[model samples]
Target: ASVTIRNAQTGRLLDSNYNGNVYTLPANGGNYQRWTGPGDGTVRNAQTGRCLDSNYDGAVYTLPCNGGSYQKWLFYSNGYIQNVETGRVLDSNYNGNVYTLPANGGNYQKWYTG
Candidate 1:
């Protein structure tokens, strides 16, 4: 099922601007805030056909879903999404900014789907 990923720490939704940079925005129920999948599936942007990718360090970007490792994700039962290659979990740091960091089983690394 499609889902909206919310950071457990900041309570912000994962969102992307037109250029595809991944960031957090208030939960406004916008299409750009929606995501999908739990396996080697693509996290498609609800507003567009772009996919979330980890081509950069410490951040993710939206790109066309090309079936690359960076574009693939695995959503765990704990509600965290892990990059297929990086082994990093989606994280919201103390500053409330979201990024992928090594999994530490912290609250900031947890997420909830709606």
Candidate 2:
């Protein structure tokens, strides 16, 4: 699947982050610009269509693999998933907050169940 983003509250596409940040493609799939911020979840490169995976090192993002098992995200129930790989759960805004499973579902505690 392609890149899909939504509002944490109303589940609306909270303004595409592609165009705002310096990037090549406007839509979700093609390419995106590099972003540096507090939340280090994932950053897509506008020139190469690559995705920056949150790894142990600094500025070392994994390549973007569309439809791969490592790229597809699973948004489980209760705002968390029982099992899955790559991009397991969406960090609450990726601000040093670790995701705890089997918790109450809230805006701050919600994950994409798409």
Candidate 3:
């Protein structure tokens, strides 16, 4: 099944810049911009095989998927992605910077996989 993680409000796809940054981009199906997960369930970039990780300093990065809880993610029915290890929510503010914040059900923290 085809799936994409996107901003619920903007419909922008979550993407890795391939230089250690993550942000929104128009969907192009590029491996660096593609993600697979919630099923062994790491949000990993197909090209890099690196999982999305929270450094606990509010920044998101790509790191080797080691089956660590830090790489584990929970896709909530409310469209929020919560890092299982930290309990923080994936967020993208108006400036387009991606980070993790306390899960509060904010619009910016809501994501859709479609």
Candidate 4:
């Protein structure tokens, strides 16, 4: 089943569009906003069928699913989605694409996954 991913601070959902980009948007139960995993330690995009991946430079984007450690993520009960290799959590500034940063506990860095 796919999960709804929301930002604790912005109260917006994480959206993965057809063009292979990720960012925040208003919630309206859109299919493009649904995610399905941590299956094999990856988050699969409902619309694009890709997996979220982060680079060493902190860019957060989706690529074809391959189960690479850079693609592995752990969604926390506290709403943190961390890259297993980088240990950085998801972050947004209520604008642009989501990125990764060292865990700082800001609401923007916190998420409300469901």
Candidate 5:
């Protein structure tokens, strides 16, 4: 249950837990190295990681220096992404109860993204 941050603009996920304030390795699928940073966030692969976007740019962004609200996450027992702040599961059907990810691509692994 480690908190991690990924580069949303570039699709690069980096470890957020570190001793010092550092924002490096803004890419996806690293060497499984966990950062011991502060904050209530986690850096666990089980978390599919958050798409972190810095510079507040809509496109072509980088990893986040500080954990953003978008970096927060919650995992369901059935492998689902939950919004920590909203306490709601990411759902594609918008049914508001159960959620699911796309079957083909799995790139948008997130439920709401669909």
Candidate 6:
């Protein structure tokens, strides 16, 4: 299957480093932009072989797919992504660094995939 996770406000798409930062860049159809998950709630980049993970400090990064607490993410009904461990939502801003913040009901905090 093919899928992409992207922000609603700026319209940038998610791009994960092989083992570092998790940010959004212009839509270039890069394979790293595609993702999948297991039966559990985790977003894994198929190309990078890493799972989307975050910390209490609102850090957003991709690491090994270990199914850890920080790797557990919740996809909300209204197009928001939240870390189950921290209850923080995915937020977007200029330059496209993907981070987590308290849900503020803004489009920048909303995301979608297709």
Question: Ten-residue segment with the worst summed lDDT in candidate 4?
Answer: 15-24
Better of 4 and 6 by TM-score: 6
Q: Name the lDDT of candidate 5.
A: 0.34
Q: What is the lDDT of residue 25 in candidate 5?
A: 48
Pairs in clash, predicted candidate 3 = none
Total clashing residue pairs per candidate? Answer: 0, 2, 0, 0, 17, 0
TM-score of candidate 6 relative to the true fold: 0.94
**Higher-ranked by TM-score: 1 or 2:** 1
- Candidate 3's error at 24, in angstroms? 1.6
Estimate, for each residue in 1-114, the C-alpha lDDT of model 1 and write its tens digit. Answer: 678888887888888867877887788868888876644567888787688887447587889788888888788899888888787887765444667888888877888877
Pairs in clash, predicted candidate 4: none
Mark the regions of model 5 whose C-alpha exceeds 4 Å error after superposition: 1-39, 44-62, 85-114
| lDDT (tens digit, per residue) of candidate 2 on 56-101 | 2211234653433332334455554221333334333332223323
Error of 6 at 48 (Å): 0.8
Q: Ten consecutive residues with minimal summed lDDT in candidate 6?
A: 37-46
Q: In model 4, where do residues sit more than 4 Å from their true spots?
A: none
Give the distance in Å from residue 6's predicted Cα in candidate 1 to where it truly belongs.
0.7
Give the higher-TM-score candidate: 3 or 6. 6
| Window of ten residues with lowest summed lDDT in model 1 | 90-99
Q: What residue pairs are clashing in model 2?
A: 32-45, 32-46
TM-score of predicted structure 3: 0.86
**Candidate 6 residue pairs in clash (backbone atoms < 3 Å):** none
lDDT against the true structure, per candidate, is: 0.78, 0.34, 0.79, 0.84, 0.34, 0.86
Tell me which of candidates 1 and 5 scores higher on lDDT. 1
- State in Å the error of residue 93, model 2: 2.7
Report the lDDT tens digits of candidate 5 across residue range 1-114: 344433223333333332222233444555432433233643232222323222222111124334565345565444345444444433222121122222233323332111
- Output the number of the TM-score-best candidate: 6
